[PDB]
Amino acid sequence: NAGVTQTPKFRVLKTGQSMTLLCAQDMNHEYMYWYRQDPGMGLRLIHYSVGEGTTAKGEVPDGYNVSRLKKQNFLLGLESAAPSQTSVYFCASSPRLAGDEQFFGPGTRLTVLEDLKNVFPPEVAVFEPSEAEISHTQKATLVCLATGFYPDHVELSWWVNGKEVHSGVCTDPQPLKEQPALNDSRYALSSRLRVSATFWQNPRNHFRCQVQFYGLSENDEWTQDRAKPVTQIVSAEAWGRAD
């Protein structure tokens, strides 16, 4: 029908702050679960619930609160957020009868930092296809570079002539650390868009690389001399060219 839903998708928290993670299921499932999972790194049970009124501890319960007010909802609570709680939180649903598999939600990526001052939006740059590649292969590769972002809360997409494209795209599965020897290193992410040389050679064609950055909210306090790194889209574009 729809499955397990989760809210929010991303969140940046300052240490000490409170937050609630919301989970819903329209499958009339008796069992509900809350897992955390670091980068990669596996699924770890925080708390679970067998039905409405009840709640029960998993493998890693400290210190998360939990409530199953209604059968359809499962809530996870962070009283005083700690940087050790930076993770991806997965919710799950399972029926009691007769079994069996668990149905999972899309996940909530949370980053807890001591200071919001490390929060930076990405800079986005589009690199035009090499004329050597074009004459050699009759193909044209565009490269997009998302640089200097923190935390790793981004979604990169390619838009051709106002339409999102998936064919001919390859985005790095994970970003590089611009300064590896630093625990709060800013990130870099690349993506390639490859078309035919004739498609790129058409000046009517518009190529746009889009990076949605999930950052700060209005509620968050900003005390720095620089634009507040709020949730935003940063884009770079290129137009097709005969030569």
């Binding site: 493998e59 570079l145 770079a236």
Partner: protein, 184 residues
């Protein structure tokens, strides 16, 4: 305790077997889940009895006495690149293994490796180096230099041309940066 390899790699069109060992105690079934990055895990199989069960291109094996299970993937496709989670139940709590990230290598029909320099669309004389069209057995040399960034290999599919290509991107915040070096 569930033990699975961290990483595995196979080439498209081949057969892969992902092994998992688990410690008996209360055994009420073994699950296999597929988890694409960074998506929701999805059910693949459930095994309570011995031995081998087919479910399309995927087969699940269970040996209760050895505490051993394997997920067998035949006719390997690019879309199979994901983490595969081995999980053990005892019928309301499922404990998951750390997962095995499988990288599926593309079968490059006509390789012509080359390094190309791409120029910034805006200005500042900023640029990237693109190593592309190399076959999948080729290893991308990671940078030992502090100023140069080199990404991991990436499989691109045009599909309309039924063409697949591997690439790696490199750039440096310093000029003049050499294109012909880094990847070699």
């Amino acid at each position: 305790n569930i033990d699975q390899p961290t990483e595995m790699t196979a080439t498209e069109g081949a057969i892969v077997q992902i092994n998992c060992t688990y410690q008996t105690s209360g055994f009420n079934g073994l699950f296999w889940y597929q988890q694409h990055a960074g998506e929701a895990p999805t059910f693949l199989s459930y095994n309570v009895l011995d031995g081998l069960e087919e479910k399309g291109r995927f087969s699940s094996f269970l040996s209760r006495s050895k505490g051993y299970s394997y997920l067998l993937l035949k006719e390997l496709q690019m879309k199979d690149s994901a983490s595969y989670l081995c999980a053990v139940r005892n019928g309301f709590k499922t404990i998951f293994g750390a997962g095995t990230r499988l990288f599926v290598k593309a079968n490059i029909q006509n390789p012509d490796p080359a390094v190309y320099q791409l120029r910034d669309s805006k200005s500042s004389d900023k640029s990237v180096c693109l190593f592309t069209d190399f076959d999948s057995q080729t290893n991308v040399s990671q940078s030992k230099d502090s100023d140069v960034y080199i990404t991991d290999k990436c499989v691109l599919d045009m599909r309309s041309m039924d063409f697949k290509s591997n690439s790696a991107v490199a750039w440096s915040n310093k000029s003049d940066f050499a294109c012909a070096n880094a990847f070699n």
